[PDB]
C-alpha cells in the first residue's frame, strides 16, 4: 500500500547524506520524510555487530564488549564490538575481522541474522548480528591482540552473560557510559527467558 | 581522556540535522565526525522510548507484542517494539504506556526501564529509554484492543510467543519484504540463547 515516489537530497557529507523523502501513505496522501544514510553502503548492509561469547572452561561465559568515545553522543558508549562491512566482504568475515581488530579475540562463527535495521524512523542504516563464540581455552585468544585501524580507540569489557543486565547497569550507575540499546535488549531478553 | 571541542550546524530540517563534530583524541590530536542529531529533543532523558510489551493470558503462552510500519528512510516495512517520542514534561514510563496504547490497544502495567540508551552511537545522539511493560490479556479492557493512530501513523500490531520469538520473526522475513529492527532481532536470538 505504501512506497518511496521521490528522495531529495537536502545534504551529502562525506560519511553521512540528508534526503527528504516523499511517500504516498495508504489513504492516497503524499506525506514527507526526513531520512539520514550513510554515503559508504554499496551490500548485504552497512555493518555488523558482534555478539561475542568467551567461552572458558570452569568460569562463566562472558560478553565481550567494547567502549569508545563516540562523538555523536558526546561521550563514552558500551556496544557490540562492530564496523563496517568492506566492498566485497562477507558479513560473517566482517563480522570475524572487526572482533579481531577491536578486542585481539579470534572467533567461530555461530550464526547470522539477515540484515536489520538500526533506526527505521530515522535512517536506512542496516546491520548482520553475527553470534560469534570465542574458545578462550586456546593459545591463539591466550593473550588477545586488539588491531586497532588509525582513529579507533577501543577498551575491552567482558562481562558474564548470566548476570548481563545488573552488570551494565552497575556500569551506568559508577561510571556516566551510554550502553547500547542493541546490547540492553540482548541483556534484558537474557533475564526475561523462560 | 576524549571529548568535544566543537558542534558545527551544516543542515538544519524541522526534524533532522547534520553537524560537524571537532573532538580531541586520545593522542591529543584534534578530529572531525559528522553527527545527526533530531530537532526535537528539549529536557528529556531521552529522545524516544520503545516499549518491550509481554502479553500475558491464562492458559496461553506469553506473547512479545510487535508492530509493523512502513518507514520512509527503509523505503519498505519495518517490524519494531512499539516505540515513539517522549513529549516534553512526559515521563519515560508514561511515554510507553502511551505509545503502546495509542499503537496496539493495549493497556499495560510498567515493570522495568532502563537508562537511556543509544540507537546508533556512531552516528546520531538518539537515545530511547526500553520500557518493559507487562498486559494482563485477561483484563476485559485488554480482550479487542482498539489502536489510537495520531495523524499519519498507519500500524499492524503482530503478536508471537516468546518462547520461539526468533524462529517466528524469521518465518515472517521468509514471507515477505520486511525488515526486522535490530533491537527486536538482538531480543529474540538472546531469547534463543539462554
Ligand atoms: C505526524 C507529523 N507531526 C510528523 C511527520 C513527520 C515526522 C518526522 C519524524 N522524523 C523524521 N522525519 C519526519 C514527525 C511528525
Ligand atoms: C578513518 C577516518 N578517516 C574516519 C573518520 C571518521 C569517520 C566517520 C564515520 N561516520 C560518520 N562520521 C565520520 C570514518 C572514518
Ligand atoms: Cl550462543
Ligand atoms: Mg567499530
Ligand atoms: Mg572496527
Ligand atoms: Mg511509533
Ligand atoms: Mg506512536
Redesign the pocket.
Known amino acids: 500500500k505504501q512506497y518511496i515516489i521521490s528522495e531529495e537530497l537536502i545534504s551529502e557529507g562525506?560519511?553521512?547524506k540528508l534526503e527528504k523523502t516523499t511517500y504516498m501513505d495508504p489513504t492516497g496522501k503524499t506525506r514527507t520524510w526526513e531520512s539520514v544514510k550513510?554515503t559508504t553502503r554499496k551490500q548485504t548492509a552497512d555493518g555488523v555487530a558482534v555478539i561475542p561469547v568467551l567461552q572458558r572452561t570452569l568460569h562463566y561465559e562472558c560478553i565481550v564488549l567494547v567502549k569508545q568515545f563516540r562523538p555523536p553522543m558526546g561521550g563514552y558508549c558500551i556496544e557490540f564490538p562492530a564496523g563496517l562491512i568492506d566492498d566485497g566482504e562477507t558479513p560473517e568475515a566482517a563480522a570475524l575481522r572487526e572482533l579481531e581488530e577491536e578486542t585481539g579475540y579470534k572467533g567461530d562463527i555461530a550464526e547470522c541474522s539477515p540484515a536489520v535495521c538500526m533506526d527505521p524512523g530515522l535512517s536506512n542504516c542496516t546491520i548482520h548480528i553475527v553470534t560469534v563464540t570465542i574458545n578462550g581455552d586456546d593459545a591463539e585468544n591466550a593473550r588477545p591482540k586488539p588491531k586497532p585501524?588509525?582513529?579507533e580507540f577501543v577498551e575491552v569489557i567482558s562481562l558474564p552473560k548470566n548476570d548481563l543486565l545488573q552488570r551494565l547497569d552497575a556500569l551506568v550507575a559508577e561510571e556516566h557510559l551510554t550502553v547500547d540499546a542493541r546490547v540492553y535488549s540482548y541483556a534484558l531478553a537474557l533475564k526475561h527467558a523462560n
Open positions: 562525506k560519511w553521512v550513510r585501524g588509525d582513529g
